[PDB]
């Protein structure tokens, strides 16, 4: 975010400003996070309440996403929610009962389940079957 | 699972009586510098 009113920095909408900051505007794309959140949030597993999302910003900010949230589908309203979240450090529901989006203290490790398996997505890593992988893992643990 | 919409402002501003008081502080400071 940056005061021009604060706006979520975008690769296309803002090019001169990020040049002044000295950051490569190729790495200035929040919509990629938006689509990942959109496809991830709407997945049936979230509807089953078996998935919970964390976001680690490039700056080092860790954001906890409550599964109950319904982020806007359009990017423009999505940007408005990020700037509110980053400045206020939390987002409250319309009914005002829970904090859907909340910034939390790093590291991620403390927040994660006590027994859990950790993996990354690596193009160079060996190709695996997601279904076979999850079956062979234990039940009490998480991934 | 339950679904609740997030509450946010279209444009974030970090009522007028507070605005009036804010200008007083600037006027108090600006005048004191001129007196000094």
């Amino acid at each position: 975010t940056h005061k021009i009113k604060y706006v979520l920095l975008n690769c296309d909408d803002h090019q001169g400003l990020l040049k002044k900051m000295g950051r490569d505007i190729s790495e200035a794309r929040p919509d990629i996070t938006h689509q990942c959140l959109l496809t991830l949030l709407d997945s049936p597993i979230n509807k089953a309440g078996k998935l919970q999302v964390y976001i680690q910003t490039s700056r080092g900010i860790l954001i906890e996403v409550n599964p109950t949230v319904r982020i806007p589908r359009t990017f423009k309203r999505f940007s408005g929610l990020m700037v509110q979240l980053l400045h206020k450090l939390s987002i409250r529901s319309v009914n005002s009962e829970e904090k859907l989006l909340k910034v939390i203290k790093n590291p991620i490790t403390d927040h994660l389940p006590t027994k859990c398996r950790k993996v990354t997505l690596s193009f160079d890593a060996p190709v695996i079957r997601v279904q076979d992988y999850i079956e062979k893992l234990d039940d009490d643990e998480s991934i | 699972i339950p679904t609740h919409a997030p509450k946010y402002e279209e444009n974030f501003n970090p009522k007028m009586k507070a605005q009036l008081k804010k200008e007083r502080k600037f006027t108090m400071k600006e005048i004191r510098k001129d007196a000094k």
């Binding site: 319904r70 982020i71 806007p72 589908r73 309203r77 | 679904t3 919409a5």
Partner: peptide
């Protein structure tokens, strides 16, 4: 109740 591809209300 929001469902499917419905977007959050705009005021």
């Amino acid at each position: 109740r929001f469902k499917g591809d419905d977007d959050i209300p705009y005021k």
